[PDB]
Amino acid sequence: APQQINDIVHRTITPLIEQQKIPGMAVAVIYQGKPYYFTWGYADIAKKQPVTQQTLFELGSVSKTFTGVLGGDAIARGEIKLSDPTTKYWPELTAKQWNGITLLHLATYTAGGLPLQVPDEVKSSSDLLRFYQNWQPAWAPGTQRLYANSSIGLFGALAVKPSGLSFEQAMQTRVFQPLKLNHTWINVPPAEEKNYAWGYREGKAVHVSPGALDAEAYGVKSTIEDMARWVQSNLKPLDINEKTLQQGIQLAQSRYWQTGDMYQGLGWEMLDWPVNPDSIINGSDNKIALAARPVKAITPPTPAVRASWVHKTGATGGFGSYVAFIPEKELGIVMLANKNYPNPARVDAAWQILNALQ
Numbered sequence: 001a002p003q004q005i006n007d008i009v010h011r012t013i014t015p016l017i018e019q020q021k022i023p024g025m026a027v028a029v030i031y032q033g034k035p036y037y038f039t040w041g042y043a044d045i046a047k048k049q050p051v052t053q054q055t056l057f058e059l060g061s062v063s064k065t066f067t068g069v070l071g072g073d074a075i076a077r078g079e080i081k082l083s084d085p086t087t088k089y090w091p092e093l094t095a096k097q098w099n100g101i102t103l104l105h106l107a108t109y110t111a112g113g114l115p116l117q118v119p120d121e122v123k124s125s126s127d128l129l130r131f132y133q134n135w136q137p138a139w140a141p142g143t144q145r146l147y148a149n150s151s152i153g154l155f156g157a158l159a160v161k162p163s164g165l166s167f168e169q170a171m172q173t174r175v176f177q178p179l180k181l182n183h184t185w186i187n188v189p190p191a192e193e194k195n196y197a198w199g200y201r202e203g204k205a206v207h208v209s210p211g212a213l214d215a216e217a218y219g220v221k222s223t224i225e226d227m228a229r230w231v232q233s234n235l236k237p238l239d240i241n242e243k244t245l246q247q248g249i250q251l252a253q254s255r256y257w258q259t260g261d262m263y264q265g266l267g268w269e270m271l272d273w274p275v276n277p278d279s280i281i282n283g284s285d286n287k288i289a290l291a292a293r294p295v296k297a298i299t300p301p302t303p304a305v306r307a308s309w310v311h312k313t314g315a316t317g318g319f320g321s322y323v324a325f326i327p328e329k330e331l332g333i334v335m336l337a338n339k340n341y342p343n344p345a346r347v348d349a350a351w352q353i354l355n356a357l358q
Contacts, residue, residue, distance in 0.1 A: 001036040002031070002036075004356075004357070005029055005031055005036050005357065008352070008353050008356045008357065009027060009029060009036075009038050009353060010038070012349050012352045012353050013025065013027060013038065013040065013335075013349065014040075016345060016349050017040055017041065019345070020337075020339065020341040020342070020345060021339070022040075022041065022320075022337045022338070022339045022341060023041050023042050023045055023200050023337075023338050023339055024039075024040065024041035024042045024043050024050075024051035024055070024197060024337065024338045025039070025040045025041060025051060025335070025336065025337040025338075026038070026039045026040075026051050026053070026055060026057065026223075026224035026334075026335075026336045026337075027039075027224070027333065027334065027335050027336075028224045028225070028227060028228035028231070028333065028334045029332070029333050029353065029357070030228060030231050030232055030235065030325065030330070030331060030332035030333070031330075031331060031357055032330055032331075033232065033235075033236070033330050035225075035228035035229075035232065037053050037224055037225070037228070039051045039052060039053065039055075039224070042338075043055045043195075043196075043197035043198070043338065044197065044198050044205070045198070045200070045205070046198075046205065049197075051197065051338075052195075053223060053224055053225050054183065054195050054223055054225070055195055055196075055197050055223060055224070056183065056185070056188060056192060056195050056196045056197060056221045056222060056223055057197055057221065057222065057223075057224075057319055057321065057336040057337070057338060058199060058207070058208050058218075058220075058221050058316040058318070058319040058321075059218070059220045059221065059222055059227075059314050059319075059321050059336075060208075060218045060314030060315040060316040060319055060320070060321055060340075061149075061217070061218050061312065061313065061314035061315060062220070062312050062313070062314035062321045062322075062323055063215075063216075063217065063218050063219055063220035063314065064152050064217060064218075064267040064312065064314075065230075065234075065252070065267035065268055065312050065323070066171060066175060066220055066230075066267070067152060067155070067156040067159075067216050067217070067266075067267055068107065068152070068252040068265065068266030068267025068268060069175060069234075069245075069248050069249050069252045069266070069267065070156065070159065070160070070170060070171055070174060070175050070248070071103075071107060071155060071156065071159040071248070071252070071266055072247065072248030072249065072250070072251035072252045072266055073174050073175065073244045073245050073247070073248030074159045074160065074162070074163065074170075074248075075247075075248065075251055076243070076244035076245075076247035076248050076251065077163075077244045079159075079162035079163055080103060080158075080159055080161075080162060081103070082102065082103050082104040082107065083102055083103075083104065084102060084103050085098070085099070085100075085101065085102055086098055086101050086102065086103060086105075086106060086154070086158065087099075089103075089158040089161045089162075090129075090158060090161075092129055092133075093129070093132060093133060094133070095132075095133045095134075095135075097112075097135070097136065097137050098132075100140070100141050101141045102141070103155055103158065103159065104256065105141045105142060105151075106151050106152065106154050106155035106158070107151075107152055107155040107266050107267075108145070108151075108152075108256050108257055108264045108266070109145050109146055109147050109148050109151045109152065109264070110141060110142050110143070110144065110145050110257060110264075110295055111137065111141055111151055112137030112138060112139045112140060112141050112143070112144070113137050113138035113139055113144070113146050113292070114135065114137075114146070114148045114150045114151040114154075115135075115148055115150050116146070116147060116148045116149060116150070116290065117148075117149055117150065118131065118149060118150045118153065118211065118212040118213055119131065120211070122212045123212065127212070128212055128213075131150075132154065142295070142297060143294065143295065144292055144293060144294055144295060145257060145259050145264065145292075145293050145294075145295045146290075146291075146292045146293075147289060147290050149213065149217035149218060150213065150217075152216065152217060152267065153212075153213030153214075153216040153217040154213065154216075155216075156213070156215075156216030156217070157213060157216055167186075167215050167216055168186040168187065168215055171186060171215075172186075174242075174244075174245065175245065178240070178241075178242045178245050179229060179230070179233050179240070179245075180229065181222070181226040181229060181230060182226070183195075183222065183223045183225065183226050184220060184221070184222040184223070184226045184227075184230075185220070185221050185222070186215045186219050186220055186221075188221055195223070196221065197319075197338045198318070198338060199316060199317060199318015199319045199338050199339070199340075200318050200338055200339050201317045201318045201339075201340065205318075206317050206318040207318070208316040208317065208318075208319075209317075218314070218316060222336075224334060224336055227323065227334040227336065228332075228334055230323075230334075231323060231325050231332040231333075231334055232332075233249065234249055234252075234253070234268075234310070234325060235325050235327055235330055235332055236327075236330070237249040237250050250303065250304050251266060252265050252266040252267055252268055253265050253268055253270065253304035253305075253308075253310060254266075254301040254302060254303055254304055255270060255298050255301055255302040255305070256297075256298055256301045257295040257296065257297060257298060258295065258296045258298055259293045259294070259295050259296075260283070260293070261275075261276075261279050261283070262283060263298070263302075263308075264295070265310075267312065268310050268311070268312055269310070269311060269312060270305070270308045270309065270310045270311075271283075271308065271309045271311075272305070272307065272308060272309075273307050273308050273309045273326050273328065273329075275309045275351075277347075277348070277351045277355075280309060280311070280347050280351070281344050281347040281348050281351065282344065283347075284313055284343035284344055284346065284347040285342070285343055285344050286343060289313070289343070304327070305327075306327040306328040307326075307327075307328045308326065308327065308328075309324060309325075309326055310324065310325050310326070310327070311323060311324035311325070311347075311350075312324075313343045313346060313347070315340040315343075316340065317340065318338060318339065318340060319336070319337065319338050319339070319340060320337045320339060320340040320341050320343075320346065321334075321335065321336050321337070322334070322335045322343075322346040322347065322350055323335075324347075324350045324354065326354065326358070329357075329358045331354055331357055331358050332354075333350050333353055333354055335349065335350060
């Protein structure tokens with residue numbers, strides 16, 4: 001890789017790893033369209049397995065970007081419409097509070113205060129129906145944004161209903177395969193477990209636990225190579241042959257709502273570039289990212305803006321990930337670590353690297 005990339009990456013990541021005490025980490029920088037990989041530490045401390053370009057990391061909430069694009073693809077296929085009421089795809093949701101709540105609201109966390117997490121006691125499909133039926137919104141739809149797995153999670157499950165395919169089935173055939181993301185999984189197969197890094201929380205090795213709507217909200221595992229390819233695809237969707245998928249990616253980057261300097265897409269979140277580091281770094285801190293914030297509707301949605309800082313942070317009990325890219329500069333980065341460390345530190349490092357390259 002060019003010495004400039006090598007230097008900025010290493011001089012930025014090495015200190016990060018030491019300060020946050022990250023066991024293992026993989027980084028990919030997309031420069032002028034080409035990917036450059038970097039790896040450090042361990043995927044498995046006990047077995048001394050190093051992090052490689054083939055190591056699988058839990059993406060946590062970065063999984064929402066895949067869900068958003070899969071949803072966008074479904075829209076492009078004409079199977080669903082974001083303006084459709086949630087009840088059109090789940091007739092059993094007869095509770096009056098759902099009148100007025102559309103798939104758009106679910107996909108963008110603006111349904112009226114759906115909870116960040118689906119309760120652990122929710123296992124069965126009837127438990128899930130009950131959960132949504134009994135939920136009482138704190139606000140009218142389309143007025144406030146509250147980041148929630150139970151929101152985009154339901155969107156993902158409903159978006160694939162028409163296709164008749166399971167969520168994982170649809171994701172593999174409509175997104176992973178067409179983009180040649182052959183080492184990205186919702187459920188890691190036995191054959192790939194040798195590459196599945198362990199996450200670490202308080203020194204204990206851990207893997208994400210099964211949960212309702214986990215696949216749709218935080219269940220994707222992937223390699224730094226496939227993630228770099230995911231970034232490349234989102235940087236230049238037009239180079240994608242699959243028509244509906246090309247459209248789907250564009251739809252996930254459209255700006256639907258605005259809160260402060262941030263715009264909400266489908267999974268992806270965007271800010272106008274050039275951005276102000278502290279405007280995104282501090283904004284990343286769960287304090288701001290997870291808070292209840294009034295939203296302004298963008299009517300109609302603004303098509304993907306090339307001059308944007310597009311990103312998504314992600315975490316599970318033992319992993320921390322970050323993806324950010326700037327279409328206009330054909331620049332991007334992916335940071336995967338097997339320790340969930342502070343979001344501000346991730347964005348600060350990412351900024352430091354990308355700003356230096358353009």
